[PDB]
């Protein structure tokens, strides 16, 4: 279902001018927090002696304590590491990047500064091309020697064996194909396109 989003005390989402948001009175299970049916300026503020509220973030405990420094607050991304708590806040601080040229987006691209970019070709110092007219190979990831488009071939080719070991990497459904004449469907067929 749809988000409002209007900042209000409260939806359970902590926003500017509020320290915590646990809900209205019959929603509020937070021992850390003052419900939205409390008087103005107890409204959505931390109960006294309480360090933080789990409504602020995952790095607060149920008992209103900061989680300590190396504790996990967030999962693996493709291009990023686990989030860890810093021990001074309940927010989960931004994750650090995984190494450059880690495989992201189903081995299609590469992580650079923790974004997911470019091509898996660049990992091996090739450049991405499109195969163009074998009909299946239209949906393969295809690589070329840098500024040598004649040398374009599918990742699964014999030619690229050094780098790709004969294992084909298919494009992701939705990708342009056959030099921007087409798109790949779930079945990795290149569907003709017109505009």
């Amino acid at each position, epitope marked *: 279902g749809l988000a409002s989003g209007q900042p209000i005390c409260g939806n359970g989402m902590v926003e500017q001018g509020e320290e915590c948001d646990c809900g209205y009175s019959d929603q509020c299970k937070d021992e850390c927090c003052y419900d939205a049916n409390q008087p103005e300026g107890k409204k959505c503020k931390l109960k006294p002696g309480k360090q933080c509220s789990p409504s602020q973030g995952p790095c607060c405990t149920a008992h209103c304590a900061f989680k300590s420094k190396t504790e996990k607050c967030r999962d693996d991304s493709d291009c990023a590491k686990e989030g860890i708590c810093n021990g001074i806040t309940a927010l989960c601080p931004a994750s650090d990047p995984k190494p450059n040229f880690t495989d992201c987006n189903r081995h299609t691209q590469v992580c650079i500064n923790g974004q997911c970019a470019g091509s898996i070709c660049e990992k091996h110092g090739l450049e991405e091309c499109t195969c163009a007219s074998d*009909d299946k190979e239209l949906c393969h990831v295809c690589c070329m020697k840098k500024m040598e488009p004649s040398t374009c071939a599918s990742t699964g080719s014999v030619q690229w064996n050094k780098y790709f070991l004969g294992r084909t990497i298919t494009l992701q459904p939705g990708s342009p194909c056959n030099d921007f004449r087409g798109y790949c469907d779930v*079945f990795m067929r290149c569907r003709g396109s017109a505009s």
Partner: antibody
Amino acid sequence: QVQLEESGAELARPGSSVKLSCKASGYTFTNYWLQWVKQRTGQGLEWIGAIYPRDGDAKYSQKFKDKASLTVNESSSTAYMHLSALASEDSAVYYCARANYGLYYAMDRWGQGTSVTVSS
Amino acid sequence: DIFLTQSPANMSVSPGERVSFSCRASQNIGTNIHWYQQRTNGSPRLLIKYASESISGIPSRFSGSGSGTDFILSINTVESEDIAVYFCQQSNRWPFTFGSGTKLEVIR
């Protein structure tokens, strides 16, 4: 009107094979993936595979790769599924369905099912 | 594969009330999921595609919403010919997969 008419109920001995058919009419047979789906009494739908009648290219669920063989006769606008080396776990209803609305296709039209019974 | 569960298994509602079937995907499929109705001794019938989008000739009381891993098919409001089993199916990757279905009972 777009229609997939399937062959009628098969009885088949263990170890034998059956050839199930789906005759397409009402549209261009070679413009759409055509899919096969198994349902045991009364229980879930299970996607078997798909074939693209233009070039006969086929995709199979790993589970069905040793079971089913998909072909088409493009002239008759008919698709076939061979089920072979039959065991009881193959007794089921089998639908063909047209794949439509790309790129991630719904199955927009269905045959009536063919009921295969595998027994001695 | 991508897997689907459907909740609840059966559901039972008086005619003209509103009902909502639920589908959970084992990873983020975006909107690529579709909804089918199977009456007794029937073939599956495509109700909704992509998972808010309507199919021509489908009664308008059928709607759907959701995105990512969570989806809802809704009937507002129920009639007694809506007795059927309702399936979600994901197209996001093949092999395509189906939830195990929810059965609708109509109270009388």
